[PDB]
Amino acid sequence: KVFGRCELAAAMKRHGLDNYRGYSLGNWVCAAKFESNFNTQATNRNTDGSTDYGILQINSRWWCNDGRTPGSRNLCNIPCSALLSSDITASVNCAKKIVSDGNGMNAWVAWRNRCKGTDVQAWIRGCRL
């Protein structure tokens, strides 16, 4: 599913991401924009052989099982394919674990490079939330 911007904002808000670990909703929407362009089906191979999955491009070395990433830990206890669903619940639940891991949203290199320190509230501007 390719979410609309406000559509994803609403879903993320309903699933409790607004201000989760202190990160306002615009941060999450901005991260998803640059990670996946709001496409739940997005996948991208990394150099180490892991792959990133879904709206928040969650990696198979640490977080989900894809069966092809040696030394994988599956900390979210989910198949990586669950992160491609039109239903973002699994991505949200796993994102909540990731952002709690110590480095906050710096875990998402796209967020640090493209969202951090910017006017992220612009990403929820115009939405009825």
PDB file of all heavy atoms in Angstrom, residues 8-24:
ATOM      1  N   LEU A   8      -1.151   8.346   6.447  1.00  0.00           N
ATOM      2  CA  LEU A   8      -0.154   7.696   7.276  1.00  0.00           C
ATOM      3  C   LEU A   8      -0.036   8.386   8.642  1.00  0.00           C
ATOM      4  O   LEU A   8       0.134   7.735   9.677  1.00  0.00           O
ATOM      5  CB  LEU A   8       1.200   7.686   6.590  1.00  0.00           C
ATOM      6  CG  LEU A   8       2.306   6.926   7.378  1.00  0.00           C
ATOM      7  CD1 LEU A   8       1.965   5.506   7.617  1.00  0.00           C
ATOM      8  CD2 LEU A   8       3.651   7.109   6.663  1.00  0.00           C
ATOM      9  N   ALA A   9      -0.095   9.719   8.665  1.00  0.00           N
ATOM     10  CA  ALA A   9      -0.086  10.462   9.907  1.00  0.00           C
ATOM     11  C   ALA A   9      -1.177   9.967  10.848  1.00  0.00           C
ATOM     12  O   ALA A   9      -0.954   9.728  12.024  1.00  0.00           O
ATOM     13  CB  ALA A   9      -0.207  11.960   9.678  1.00  0.00           C
ATOM     14  N   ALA A  10      -2.377   9.790  10.304  1.00  0.00           N
ATOM     15  CA  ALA A  10      -3.481   9.298  11.131  1.00  0.00           C
ATOM     16  C   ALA A  10      -3.288   7.916  11.645  1.00  0.00           C
ATOM     17  O   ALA A  10      -3.638   7.607  12.810  1.00  0.00           O
ATOM     18  CB  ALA A  10      -4.800   9.422  10.366  1.00  0.00           C
ATOM     19  N   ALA A  11      -2.736   7.047  10.815  1.00  0.00           N
ATOM     20  CA  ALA A  11      -2.494   5.693  11.225  1.00  0.00           C
ATOM     21  C   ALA A  11      -1.431   5.634  12.312  1.00  0.00           C
ATOM     22  O   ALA A  11      -1.576   4.931  13.311  1.00  0.00           O
ATOM     23  CB  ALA A  11      -2.141   4.822  10.022  1.00  0.00           C
ATOM     24  N   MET A  12      -0.342   6.362  12.095  1.00  0.00           N
ATOM     25  CA  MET A  12       0.701   6.420  13.087  1.00  0.00           C
ATOM     26  C   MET A  12       0.221   6.974  14.413  1.00  0.00           C
ATOM     27  O   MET A  12       0.606   6.426  15.481  1.00  0.00           O
ATOM     28  CB  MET A  12       1.884   7.229  12.548  1.00  0.00           C
ATOM     29  CG  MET A  12       2.630   6.526  11.441  1.00  0.00           C
ATOM     30  SD  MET A  12       4.013   7.530  10.863  1.00  0.00           S
ATOM     31  CE  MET A  12       5.108   6.313  10.314  1.00  0.00           C
ATOM     32  N   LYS A  13      -0.631   8.003  14.354  1.00  0.00           N
ATOM     33  CA  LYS A  13      -1.197   8.599  15.580  1.00  0.00           C
ATOM     34  C   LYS A  13      -2.095   7.614  16.298  1.00  0.00           C
ATOM     35  O   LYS A  13      -1.968   7.406  17.498  1.00  0.00           O
ATOM     36  CB  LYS A  13      -1.928   9.850  15.236  1.00  0.00           C
ATOM     37  CG  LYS A  13      -2.489  10.565  16.479  1.00  0.00           C
ATOM     38  CD  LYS A  13      -3.057  11.902  16.187  1.00  0.00           C
ATOM     39  CE  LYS A  13      -3.572  12.452  17.531  1.00  0.00           C
ATOM     40  NZ  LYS A  13      -4.157  13.788  17.261  1.00  0.00           N
ATOM     41  N   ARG A  14      -2.909   6.904  15.538  1.00  0.00           N
ATOM     42  CA  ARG A  14      -3.812   5.914  16.170  1.00  0.00           C
ATOM     43  C   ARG A  14      -3.040   4.815  16.859  1.00  0.00           C
ATOM     44  O   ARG A  14      -3.470   4.328  17.920  1.00  0.00           O
ATOM     45  CB  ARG A  14      -4.729   5.301  15.119  1.00  0.00           C
ATOM     46  CG  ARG A  14      -5.548   4.182  15.622  1.00  0.00           C
ATOM     47  CD  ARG A  14      -6.632   3.874  14.640  1.00  0.00           C
ATOM     48  NE  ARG A  14      -6.053   3.541  13.323  1.00  0.00           N
ATOM     49  CZ  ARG A  14      -5.633   2.345  12.926  1.00  0.00           C
ATOM     50  NH1 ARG A  14      -5.666   1.227  13.693  1.00  0.00           N
ATOM     51  NH2 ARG A  14      -5.171   2.306  11.709  1.00  0.00           N
ATOM     52  N   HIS A  15      -1.890   4.413  16.277  1.00  0.00           N
ATOM     53  CA  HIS A  15      -1.049   3.371  16.809  1.00  0.00           C
ATOM     54  C   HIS A  15      -0.053   3.863  17.888  1.00  0.00           C
ATOM     55  O   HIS A  15       0.747   3.063  18.344  1.00  0.00           O
ATOM     56  CB  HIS A  15      -0.274   2.686  15.674  1.00  0.00           C
ATOM     57  CG  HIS A  15      -1.092   1.698  14.915  1.00  0.00           C
ATOM     58  ND1 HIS A  15      -1.442   1.820  13.595  1.00  0.00           N
ATOM     59  CD2 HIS A  15      -1.636   0.537  15.333  1.00  0.00           C
ATOM     60  CE1 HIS A  15      -2.130   0.761  13.217  1.00  0.00           C
ATOM     61  NE2 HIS A  15      -2.282  -0.015  14.261  1.00  0.00           N
ATOM     62  N   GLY A  16      -0.133   5.135  18.272  1.00  0.00           N
ATOM     63  CA  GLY A  16       0.549   5.658  19.427  1.00  0.00           C
ATOM     64  C   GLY A  16       1.969   6.121  19.219  1.00  0.00           C
ATOM     65  O   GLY A  16       2.717   6.227  20.211  1.00  0.00           O
ATOM     66  N   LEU A  17       2.296   6.470  17.974  1.00  0.00           N
ATOM     67  CA  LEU A  17       3.606   7.033  17.680  1.00  0.00           C
ATOM     68  C   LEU A  17       3.776   8.494  17.957  1.00  0.00           C
ATOM     69  O   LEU A  17       4.921   8.958  18.146  1.00  0.00           O
ATOM     70  CB  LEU A  17       4.049   6.697  16.254  1.00  0.00           C
ATOM     71  CG  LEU A  17       4.560   5.314  15.960  1.00  0.00           C
ATOM     72  CD1 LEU A  17       4.942   5.274  14.484  1.00  0.00           C
ATOM     73  CD2 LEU A  17       5.746   4.884  16.794  1.00  0.00           C
ATOM     74  N   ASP A  18       2.723   9.307  17.977  1.00  0.00           N
ATOM     75  CA  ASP A  18       2.880  10.744  18.293  1.00  0.00           C
ATOM     76  C   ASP A  18       3.443  10.936  19.693  1.00  0.00           C
ATOM     77  O   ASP A  18       2.834  10.555  20.708  1.00  0.00           O
ATOM     78  CB  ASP A  18       1.550  11.516  18.167  1.00  0.00           C
ATOM     79  CG  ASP A  18       1.716  13.070  18.231  1.00  0.00           C
ATOM     80  OD1 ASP A  18       2.835  13.672  18.070  1.00  0.00           O
ATOM     81  OD2 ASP A  18       0.626  13.748  18.332  1.00  0.00           O
ATOM     82  N   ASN A  19       4.651  11.514  19.747  1.00  0.00           N
ATOM     83  CA  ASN A  19       5.421  11.723  20.956  1.00  0.00           C
ATOM     84  C   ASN A  19       5.961  10.486  21.617  1.00  0.00           C
ATOM     85  O   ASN A  19       6.349  10.506  22.761  1.00  0.00           O
ATOM     86  CB  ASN A  19       4.667  12.598  21.966  1.00  0.00           C
ATOM     87  CG  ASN A  19       4.167  13.881  21.353  1.00  0.00           C
ATOM     88  OD1 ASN A  19       2.924  14.190  21.401  1.00  0.00           O
ATOM     89  ND2 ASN A  19       5.079  14.629  20.713  1.00  0.00           N
ATOM     90  N   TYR A  20       6.014   9.362  20.879  1.00  0.00           N
ATOM     91  CA  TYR A  20       6.565   8.161  21.410  1.00  0.00           C
ATOM     92  C   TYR A  20       8.076   8.323  21.628  1.00  0.00           C
ATOM     93  O   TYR A  20       8.766   8.776  20.698  1.00  0.00           O
ATOM     94  CB  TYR A  20       6.239   6.969  20.505  1.00  0.00           C
ATOM     95  CG  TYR A  20       6.607   5.685  21.167  1.00  0.00           C
ATOM     96  CD1 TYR A  20       5.675   4.999  21.966  1.00  0.00           C
ATOM     97  CD2 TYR A  20       7.869   5.107  21.025  1.00  0.00           C
ATOM     98  CE1 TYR A  20       6.014   3.848  22.643  1.00  0.00           C
ATOM     99  CE2 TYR A  20       8.223   3.933  21.678  1.00  0.00           C
ATOM    100  CZ  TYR A  20       7.283   3.285  22.495  1.00  0.00           C
ATOM    101  OH  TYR A  20       7.643   2.109  23.118  1.00  0.00           O
ATOM    102  N   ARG A  21       8.559   8.070  22.836  1.00  0.00           N
ATOM    103  CA  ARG A  21       9.962   8.368  23.194  1.00  0.00           C
ATOM    104  C   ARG A  21      10.332   9.822  22.906  1.00  0.00           C
ATOM    105  O   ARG A  21      11.489  10.146  22.674  1.00  0.00           O
ATOM    106  CB  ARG A  21      10.915   7.400  22.511  1.00  0.00           C
ATOM    107  CG  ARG A  21      10.856   6.012  23.116  1.00  0.00           C
ATOM    108  CD  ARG A  21      11.820   5.870  24.277  1.00  0.00           C
ATOM    109  NE  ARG A  21      11.518   4.674  25.087  1.00  0.00           N
ATOM    110  CZ  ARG A  21      12.386   4.085  25.922  1.00  0.00           C
ATOM    111  NH1 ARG A  21      13.640   4.549  26.040  1.00  0.00           N
ATOM    112  NH2 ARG A  21      12.008   2.995  26.618  1.00  0.00           N
ATOM    113  N   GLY A  22       9.359  10.702  22.995  1.00  0.00           N
ATOM    114  CA  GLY A  22       9.536  12.101  22.725  1.00  0.00           C
ATOM    115  C   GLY A  22       9.607  12.616  21.309  1.00  0.00           C
ATOM    116  O   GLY A  22       9.851  13.813  21.078  1.00  0.00           O
ATOM    117  N   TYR A  23       9.306  11.741  20.347  1.00  0.00           N
ATOM    118  CA  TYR A  23       9.374  12.141  18.959  1.00  0.00           C
ATOM    119  C   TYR A  23       7.991  12.442  18.428  1.00  0.00           C
ATOM    120  O   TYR A  23       7.122  11.548  18.370  1.00  0.00           O
ATOM    121  CB  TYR A  23      10.014  11.022  18.141  1.00  0.00           C
ATOM    122  CG  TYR A  23      11.487  10.887  18.453  1.00  0.00           C
ATOM    123  CD1 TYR A  23      11.918  10.017  19.429  1.00  0.00           C
ATOM    124  CD2 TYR A  23      12.418  11.640  17.811  1.00  0.00           C
ATOM    125  CE1 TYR A  23      13.294   9.898  19.754  1.00  0.00           C
ATOM    126  CE2 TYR A  23      13.759  11.508  18.069  1.00  0.00           C
ATOM    127  CZ  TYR A  23      14.197  10.679  19.065  1.00  0.00           C
ATOM    128  OH  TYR A  23      15.560  10.539  19.341  1.00  0.00           O
ATOM    129  N   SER A  24       7.809  13.697  18.048  1.00  0.00           N
ATOM    130  CA  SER A  24       6.510  14.171  17.554  1.00  0.00           C
ATOM    131  C   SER A  24       6.157  13.469  16.245  1.00  0.00           C
ATOM    132  O   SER A  24       7.008  12.958  15.497  1.00  0.00           O
ATOM    133  CB  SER A  24       6.531  15.670  17.309  1.00  0.00           C
ATOM    134  OG  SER A  24       7.429  15.986  16.266  1.00  0.00           O
TER     135      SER A  24
END
